[PDB]
Short mmCIF file of C-alpha atoms and ligand atoms in Angstrom, two decimals:
data_model
loop_
_atom_site.label_atom_id
_atom_site.label_comp_id
_atom_site.label_asym_id
_atom_site.label_seq_id
_atom_site.Cartn_x
_atom_site.Cartn_y
_atom_site.Cartn_z
CA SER A 9 155.34 60.07 -105.84
CA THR A 10 157.36 61.65 -103.04
CA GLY A 11 161.00 61.98 -101.99
CA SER A 12 162.74 62.71 -98.72
CA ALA A 13 166.43 63.34 -98.07
CA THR A 14 168.52 64.48 -95.14
CA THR A 15 170.37 67.76 -95.44
CA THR A 16 173.51 68.35 -93.37
CA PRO A 17 175.46 71.48 -92.42
CA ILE A 18 178.88 71.52 -94.05
CA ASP A 19 180.62 72.87 -90.97
CA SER A 20 180.11 73.94 -87.35
CA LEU A 21 178.78 77.37 -88.41
CA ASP A 22 176.01 76.11 -90.71
CA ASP A 23 177.75 77.90 -93.59
CA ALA A 24 175.77 75.81 -96.10
CA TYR A 25 173.88 72.52 -96.30
CA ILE A 26 174.52 69.45 -98.44
CA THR A 27 172.08 66.79 -99.56
CA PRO A 28 172.99 63.52 -101.29
CA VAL A 29 171.82 63.13 -104.89
CA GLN A 30 172.05 60.07 -107.15
CA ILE A 31 173.04 60.83 -110.76
CA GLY A 32 173.33 58.37 -113.61
CA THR A 33 173.34 54.61 -114.07
CA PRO A 34 174.84 53.06 -112.06
CA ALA A 35 174.24 55.80 -109.53
CA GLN A 36 176.98 58.31 -108.79
CA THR A 37 176.12 59.98 -105.49
CA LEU A 38 177.18 63.61 -105.14
CA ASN A 39 176.50 65.94 -102.22
CA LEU A 40 174.76 69.02 -103.58
CA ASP A 41 173.86 72.42 -102.18
CA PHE A 42 170.09 72.76 -102.69
CA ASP A 43 169.60 76.38 -103.71
CA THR A 44 166.14 77.96 -103.85
CA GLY A 45 167.81 81.12 -105.21
CA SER A 46 169.04 79.65 -108.52
CA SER A 47 167.86 77.23 -111.20
CA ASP A 48 170.83 75.22 -112.47
CA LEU A 49 171.79 71.72 -111.39
CA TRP A 50 175.56 71.72 -111.89
CA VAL A 51 178.26 69.36 -110.71
CA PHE A 52 182.00 68.96 -110.38
CA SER A 53 182.89 66.46 -113.09
CA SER A 54 185.49 64.49 -114.99
CA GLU A 55 185.56 67.56 -117.29
CA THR A 56 186.40 70.11 -114.59
CA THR A 57 189.88 71.62 -114.88
CA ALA A 58 192.04 69.39 -112.68
CA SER A 59 193.65 72.31 -110.81
CA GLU A 60 190.14 73.46 -109.85
CA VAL A 61 189.12 70.18 -108.22
CA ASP A 62 190.22 69.80 -104.59
CA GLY A 63 188.49 66.98 -102.70
CA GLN A 64 185.06 67.07 -104.36
CA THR A 65 183.30 63.98 -105.68
CA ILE A 66 182.96 64.20 -109.46
CA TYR A 67 180.31 63.11 -111.94
CA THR A 68 181.82 61.11 -114.80
CA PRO A 69 179.22 61.09 -117.58
CA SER A 70 181.15 58.54 -119.67
CA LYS A 71 180.46 55.97 -116.91
CA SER A 72 176.69 56.58 -116.93
CA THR A 73 174.84 54.47 -119.45
CA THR A 74 171.89 56.88 -119.27
CA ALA A 75 173.92 60.09 -119.85
CA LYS A 76 173.39 61.87 -123.16
CA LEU A 77 175.43 64.91 -124.21
CA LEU A 78 173.19 67.83 -125.03
CA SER A 79 174.74 68.83 -128.30
CA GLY A 80 175.95 72.41 -128.44
CA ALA A 81 174.46 73.32 -125.06
CA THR A 82 176.54 75.32 -122.58
CA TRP A 83 175.94 77.03 -119.25
CA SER A 84 177.58 79.78 -117.25
CA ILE A 85 176.52 81.20 -113.91
CA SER A 86 177.71 83.83 -111.48
CA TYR A 87 176.53 84.16 -107.89
CA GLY A 88 176.20 87.13 -105.55
CA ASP A 89 179.53 86.43 -103.80
CA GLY A 90 181.54 86.79 -107.01
CA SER A 91 181.83 83.03 -107.54
CA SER A 92 181.10 81.39 -110.89
CA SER A 93 181.14 78.16 -112.87
CA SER A 94 180.48 77.02 -116.44
CA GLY A 95 180.59 74.05 -118.78
CA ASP A 96 178.53 71.74 -120.96
CA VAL A 97 175.31 69.81 -120.46
CA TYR A 98 174.13 66.23 -120.26
CA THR A 99 170.71 64.78 -119.62
CA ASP A 100 170.70 61.92 -117.11
CA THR A 101 168.63 60.22 -114.43
CA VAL A 102 168.63 62.08 -111.10
CA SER A 103 167.16 60.85 -107.82
CA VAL A 104 166.67 62.63 -104.51
CA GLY A 105 165.57 60.64 -101.52
CA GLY A 106 163.67 58.06 -103.57
CA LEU A 107 162.16 60.48 -106.11
CA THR A 108 163.44 59.94 -109.64
CA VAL A 109 163.50 62.23 -112.67
CA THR A 110 164.63 60.89 -116.05
CA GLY A 111 166.11 63.30 -118.59
CA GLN A 112 167.20 65.89 -116.04
CA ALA A 113 169.69 68.45 -117.31
CA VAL A 114 172.96 67.86 -115.43
CA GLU A 115 175.33 70.76 -116.03
CA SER A 116 178.87 69.46 -116.03
CA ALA A 117 181.44 72.03 -114.91
CA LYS A 118 184.48 72.66 -117.09
CA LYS A 119 185.44 75.61 -114.91
CA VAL A 120 184.66 76.69 -111.36
CA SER A 121 185.93 79.68 -109.39
CA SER A 122 188.16 79.52 -106.32
CA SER A 123 185.44 79.59 -103.65
CA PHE A 124 183.96 76.42 -105.11
CA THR A 125 187.35 74.71 -105.39
CA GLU A 126 188.09 75.62 -101.77
CA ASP A 127 184.92 74.03 -100.44
CA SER A 128 185.67 70.34 -100.59
CA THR A 129 182.29 69.34 -99.13
CA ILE A 130 180.11 70.77 -101.91
CA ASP A 131 180.05 68.74 -105.12
CA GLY A 132 177.70 71.10 -106.95
CA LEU A 133 174.37 72.92 -106.71
CA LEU A 134 170.78 71.83 -107.23
CA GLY A 135 168.70 74.84 -108.13
CA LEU A 136 165.11 75.13 -106.92
CA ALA A 137 164.14 78.65 -107.98
CA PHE A 138 161.97 79.08 -111.11
CA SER A 139 163.16 77.57 -114.38
CA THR A 140 163.06 81.00 -116.05
CA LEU A 141 166.44 81.61 -114.37
CA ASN A 142 168.16 78.54 -115.84
CA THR A 143 171.29 79.54 -117.76
CA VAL A 144 171.59 76.71 -120.31
CA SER A 145 172.13 78.11 -123.82
CA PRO A 146 171.02 78.08 -126.55
CA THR A 147 168.10 76.09 -125.06
CA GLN A 148 167.05 76.78 -121.38
CA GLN A 149 166.41 73.72 -119.13
CA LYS A 150 164.00 72.84 -116.28
CA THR A 151 164.80 72.38 -112.59
CA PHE A 152 164.57 69.04 -110.82
CA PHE A 153 161.40 70.23 -109.06
CA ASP A 154 159.78 71.47 -112.28
CA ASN A 155 160.51 68.12 -113.94
CA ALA A 156 159.19 66.15 -110.96
CA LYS A 157 156.20 68.32 -110.14
CA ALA A 158 153.42 66.68 -112.16
CA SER A 159 154.33 63.26 -110.74
CA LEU A 160 154.39 64.42 -107.11
CA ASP A 161 151.45 63.68 -104.81
CA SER A 162 151.27 67.45 -104.28
CA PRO A 163 153.27 70.05 -106.26
CA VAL A 164 155.39 71.17 -103.31
CA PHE A 165 158.70 70.77 -101.59
CA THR A 166 159.66 71.68 -98.03
CA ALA A 167 162.86 72.84 -96.38
CA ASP A 168 163.51 71.96 -92.74
CA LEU A 169 167.08 73.12 -92.14
CA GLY A 170 168.68 72.39 -88.76
CA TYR A 171 170.59 74.72 -86.50
CA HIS A 172 173.80 72.77 -85.86
CA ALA A 173 171.72 69.69 -86.61
CA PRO A 174 170.39 67.47 -89.39
CA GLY A 175 167.43 68.53 -91.46
CA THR A 176 165.20 67.40 -94.28
CA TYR A 177 164.12 68.27 -97.81
CA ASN A 178 160.81 66.64 -98.72
CA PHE A 179 159.22 66.56 -102.17
CA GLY A 180 155.54 65.99 -102.76
CA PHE A 181 154.14 66.06 -99.23
CA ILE A 182 153.92 68.08 -96.05
CA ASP A 183 155.14 66.31 -92.89
CA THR A 184 152.61 67.61 -90.37
CA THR A 185 154.72 66.31 -87.47
CA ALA A 186 157.65 68.56 -88.43
CA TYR A 187 156.30 71.87 -87.14
CA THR A 188 154.24 73.38 -84.33
CA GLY A 189 151.05 75.40 -84.74
CA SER A 190 149.91 76.19 -88.26
CA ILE A 191 151.60 76.95 -91.55
CA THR A 192 150.95 80.55 -92.64
CA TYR A 193 150.98 80.95 -96.39
CA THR A 194 151.92 84.16 -98.13
CA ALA A 195 151.92 85.38 -101.73
CA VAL A 196 154.86 84.85 -104.08
CA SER A 197 156.02 86.91 -107.03
CA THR A 198 157.88 84.94 -109.69
CA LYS A 199 158.66 88.07 -111.70
CA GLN A 200 162.38 87.89 -110.87
CA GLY A 201 162.44 84.08 -110.96
CA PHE A 202 162.77 83.80 -107.17
CA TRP A 203 160.58 82.63 -104.33
CA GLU A 204 159.97 86.31 -103.62
CA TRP A 205 157.53 87.40 -100.92
CA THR A 206 156.79 90.32 -98.57
CA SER A 207 157.42 90.02 -94.87
CA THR A 208 155.06 92.08 -92.72
CA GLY A 209 157.74 93.41 -90.35
CA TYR A 210 160.21 92.62 -87.60
CA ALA A 211 161.12 92.82 -83.92
CA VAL A 212 164.49 92.78 -82.17
CA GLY A 213 164.64 90.72 -79.00
CA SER A 214 161.65 91.44 -76.74
CA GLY A 215 161.08 94.77 -78.50
CA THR A 216 157.82 95.90 -80.07
CA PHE A 217 156.97 94.59 -83.54
CA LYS A 218 157.50 97.10 -86.35
CA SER A 219 154.94 96.68 -89.14
CA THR A 220 156.70 97.39 -92.42
CA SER A 221 156.76 95.65 -95.77
CA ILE A 222 160.04 93.88 -96.52
CA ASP A 223 160.21 92.36 -99.98
CA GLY A 224 162.76 89.55 -100.17
CA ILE A 225 163.53 86.04 -101.32
CA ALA A 226 163.47 82.67 -99.55
CA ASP A 227 166.96 81.44 -100.43
CA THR A 228 168.35 78.21 -99.03
CA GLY A 229 171.61 78.82 -100.93
CA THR A 230 172.44 82.03 -99.05
CA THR A 231 173.92 81.58 -95.59
CA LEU A 232 172.95 84.83 -93.86
CA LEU A 233 169.94 87.09 -93.44
CA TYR A 234 170.24 90.21 -95.61
CA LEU A 235 167.83 93.01 -94.71
CA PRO A 236 167.51 96.78 -95.25
CA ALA A 237 170.20 98.94 -93.67
CA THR A 238 167.67 100.57 -91.33
CA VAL A 239 166.55 97.19 -89.96
CA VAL A 240 170.07 95.85 -89.61
CA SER A 241 171.20 99.01 -87.80
CA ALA A 242 168.28 98.60 -85.38
CA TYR A 243 169.31 94.99 -84.67
CA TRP A 244 173.01 95.62 -84.04
CA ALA A 245 172.30 98.67 -81.91
CA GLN A 246 171.02 96.17 -79.33
CA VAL A 247 174.39 94.37 -79.19
CA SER A 248 177.00 96.07 -77.02
CA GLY A 249 180.18 96.83 -78.93
CA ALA A 250 178.82 95.82 -82.33
CA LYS A 251 179.97 97.84 -85.31
CA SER A 252 180.01 97.74 -89.08
CA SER A 253 183.51 97.11 -90.33
CA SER A 254 184.40 98.07 -93.89
CA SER A 255 187.53 95.93 -93.63
CA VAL A 256 185.61 92.81 -92.58
CA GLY A 257 182.65 93.54 -94.86
CA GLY A 258 179.81 93.94 -92.42
CA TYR A 259 178.71 93.97 -88.81
CA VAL A 260 180.93 92.31 -86.27
CA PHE A 261 180.48 92.05 -82.51
CA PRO A 262 182.45 91.01 -79.43
CA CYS A 263 182.26 87.25 -79.24
CA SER A 264 181.15 87.31 -75.58
CA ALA A 265 178.15 89.55 -76.29
CA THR A 266 174.64 88.25 -75.80
CA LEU A 267 172.76 88.30 -79.08
CA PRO A 268 169.05 89.17 -79.05
CA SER A 269 166.60 87.15 -81.12
CA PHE A 270 165.22 88.54 -84.37
CA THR A 271 161.57 88.08 -85.32
CA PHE A 272 160.14 88.38 -88.82
CA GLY A 273 156.51 88.55 -89.85
CA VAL A 274 154.67 86.21 -92.17
CA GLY A 275 151.22 87.72 -92.45
CA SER A 276 149.97 87.91 -88.87
CA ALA A 277 152.32 85.08 -87.85
CA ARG A 278 155.81 85.48 -86.43
CA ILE A 279 159.00 83.45 -86.86
CA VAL A 280 161.53 83.90 -84.08
CA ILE A 281 165.23 83.47 -84.89
CA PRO A 282 167.12 82.72 -81.66
CA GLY A 283 170.05 84.99 -80.95
CA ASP A 284 172.65 82.28 -81.24
CA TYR A 285 171.62 81.60 -84.89
CA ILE A 286 173.09 85.03 -85.65
CA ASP A 287 176.61 84.16 -84.34
CA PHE A 288 179.05 83.26 -87.15
CA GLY A 289 182.07 83.00 -84.89
CA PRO A 290 185.53 84.58 -84.90
CA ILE A 291 186.38 86.71 -87.92
CA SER A 292 189.72 84.84 -88.07
CA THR A 293 190.99 81.97 -85.98
CA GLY A 294 191.63 83.06 -82.39
CA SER A 295 189.97 86.46 -82.68
CA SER A 296 187.51 87.69 -80.04
CA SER A 297 185.62 89.65 -82.73
CA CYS A 298 182.77 87.65 -84.26
CA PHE A 299 180.93 87.90 -87.57
CA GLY A 300 177.23 88.72 -87.53
CA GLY A 301 174.55 86.68 -89.25
CA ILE A 302 172.29 89.63 -90.10
CA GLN A 303 173.79 92.00 -92.65
CA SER A 304 172.68 94.89 -94.85
CA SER A 305 171.19 94.11 -98.24
CA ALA A 306 172.10 97.58 -99.53
CA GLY A 307 175.00 96.31 -101.66
CA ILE A 308 173.21 93.24 -103.05
CA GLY A 309 170.04 95.03 -104.11
CA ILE A 310 167.53 92.53 -102.78
CA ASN A 311 166.57 91.29 -99.32
CA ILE A 312 167.45 87.66 -98.72
CA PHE A 313 165.90 85.37 -96.15
CA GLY A 314 168.84 82.96 -96.17
CA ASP A 315 169.61 80.01 -93.95
CA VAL A 316 169.81 82.10 -90.75
CA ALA A 317 166.09 82.84 -91.21
CA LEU A 318 164.87 79.69 -92.90
CA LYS A 319 166.37 77.29 -90.36
CA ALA A 320 164.17 78.91 -87.70
CA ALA A 321 161.13 77.64 -89.64
CA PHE A 322 159.53 74.78 -91.52
CA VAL A 323 159.20 76.25 -95.02
CA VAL A 324 156.84 75.14 -97.75
CA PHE A 325 157.66 75.97 -101.35
CA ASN A 326 154.24 75.53 -102.91
CA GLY A 327 154.45 75.12 -106.70
CA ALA A 328 150.72 75.16 -107.42
CA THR A 329 149.56 77.04 -110.52
CA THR A 330 149.84 80.19 -108.43
CA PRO A 331 152.88 79.52 -106.23
CA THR A 332 152.97 80.50 -102.55
CA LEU A 333 155.31 80.15 -99.59
CA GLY A 334 154.39 78.71 -96.22
CA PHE A 335 156.17 79.24 -92.89
CA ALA A 336 155.63 77.47 -89.58
CA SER A 337 157.46 77.58 -86.29
CA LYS A 338 159.07 74.31 -85.20
O1 D97 B 4 162.23 64.40 -85.12
C1 D97 B 4 161.32 65.26 -85.79
C2 D97 B 4 162.17 66.09 -86.83
N1 D97 B 4 162.94 67.19 -86.16
C3 D97 B 4 163.83 67.97 -87.08
C4 D97 B 4 164.66 67.07 -87.96
C5 D97 B 4 164.66 67.15 -89.35
N2 D97 B 4 165.36 66.37 -90.15
C6 D97 B 4 166.13 65.39 -89.58
C7 D97 B 4 166.84 64.50 -90.41
C8 D97 B 4 167.57 63.48 -89.87
C9 D97 B 4 167.62 63.31 -88.49
C10 D97 B 4 166.96 64.16 -87.66
C11 D97 B 4 166.19 65.22 -88.18
C12 D97 B 4 165.44 66.10 -87.39
C13 D97 B 4 161.19 66.71 -87.86
C14 D97 B 4 161.17 65.95 -89.17
O2 D97 B 4 160.27 64.86 -88.91
C15 D97 B 4 159.66 65.11 -87.65
O3 D97 B 4 159.85 66.49 -87.40
C16 D97 B 4 160.35 64.28 -86.54
N3 D97 B 4 159.38 63.65 -85.52
C17 D97 B 4 158.25 64.54 -85.11
C18 D97 B 4 157.36 63.82 -84.13
O4 D97 B 4 156.76 62.67 -84.72
C19 D97 B 4 157.33 62.39 -86.00
C20 D97 B 4 158.83 62.31 -85.92
O1 D97 B 5 175.66 83.08 -99.11
C1 D97 B 5 176.22 83.33 -100.40
C2 D97 B 5 176.34 81.94 -101.15
N1 D97 B 5 177.51 81.22 -100.56
C3 D97 B 5 177.19 80.50 -99.29
C4 D97 B 5 178.40 79.87 -98.66
C5 D97 B 5 178.90 78.64 -99.07
N2 D97 B 5 179.96 78.04 -98.56
C6 D97 B 5 180.62 78.67 -97.54
C7 D97 B 5 181.75 78.05 -96.96
C8 D97 B 5 182.42 78.66 -95.93
C9 D97 B 5 182.00 79.89 -95.45
C10 D97 B 5 180.92 80.51 -95.98
C11 D97 B 5 180.20 79.92 -97.04
C12 D97 B 5 179.06 80.50 -97.64
C13 D97 B 5 176.51 82.17 -102.68
C14 D97 B 5 175.19 82.07 -103.43
O2 D97 B 5 174.70 83.42 -103.47
C15 D97 B 5 175.62 84.20 -102.74
O3 D97 B 5 176.87 83.55 -102.90
C16 D97 B 5 175.23 84.23 -101.22
N3 D97 B 5 175.31 85.65 -100.66
C17 D97 B 5 176.64 86.33 -100.86
C18 D97 B 5 176.64 87.66 -100.13
O4 D97 B 5 175.54 88.47 -100.53
C19 D97 B 5 174.82 87.87 -101.59
C20 D97 B 5 174.22 86.55 -101.18
#
């Protein structure tokens, strides 16, 4: 089997991407944030505190003839931005782009934090990291991909995120028309439950490539590119007037500045992020100071190849017995 769905930026800055997902019988379609950095499928629901729902589409398990309450099961998650959510658990039928899993754990939110409430376009998350990170207690649950994997034509999914444009998540096959050149595969460590890999180095603009090992995660659920302080300082030094602002919480730059590209290494291959992918616009409406899309990972403790990086590539999440990651230019 295979599945294919379109993923859409939530706003003009590509702050996140949403993908439609069918849950239950009859189907209830929710727009979920596919997140390769976490492993819970959770949704706004009929059980979510009313004051914490503001425009989202909700899952109502009582209207799904295939929903079954998972007795005594609960979940609770926190993310790197201080946001959180929690609730109870159902199993139900979930479909993505024609690919159907029966008995998928659907984590119904009783509570969500303010950032979630404030984003009306995101109805929940669909985790695609390793199932070892799933938070359901007292019995941990499997991701949509883990549940689907044995039925897929090939045990893979791909992320093709657009810059200010539509994109695609495919399950079970590699669309060889979606990229240029070859896909370079690189080793993955699952020891932290992430799609964790080691980049071979970087360049800034037309500068010389610096060979250096950068361990980080391929994370579709993180907006920006988080890299070591040394690397980030080297990037922003090439932007006139850029500075790190404690008040704003990272590097900012004059909105009229020309941003250089940023290149990262995948083995001997190179993925080039165009400069404009790094522009996250005015820090507040009407300001001529703009937020940067490459930021230090010093505070977070791990390097993150988020959407800024991934949308410059066609990315293969290969869930073979020994998982690997593939990157191609496009
Ligand atoms: O247009 C190309 C697409 N470009 C990015 C993309 C991704 N996702 C998108 C989703 C919706 C609308 C548009 C989308 C566009 C990707 C995905 O498929 C192929 O490469 C496709 N053709 C390549 C040439 O022969 C085959 C067709
Ligand atoms: O990008 C962040 C994610 N939120 C994306 C998001 C969603 N919606 C948004 C809507 C508007 C403007 C911006 C938005 C940003 C979540 C999941 O993990 C973290 O928090 C992640 N990083 C936080 C900073 O360092 C750690 C990694």
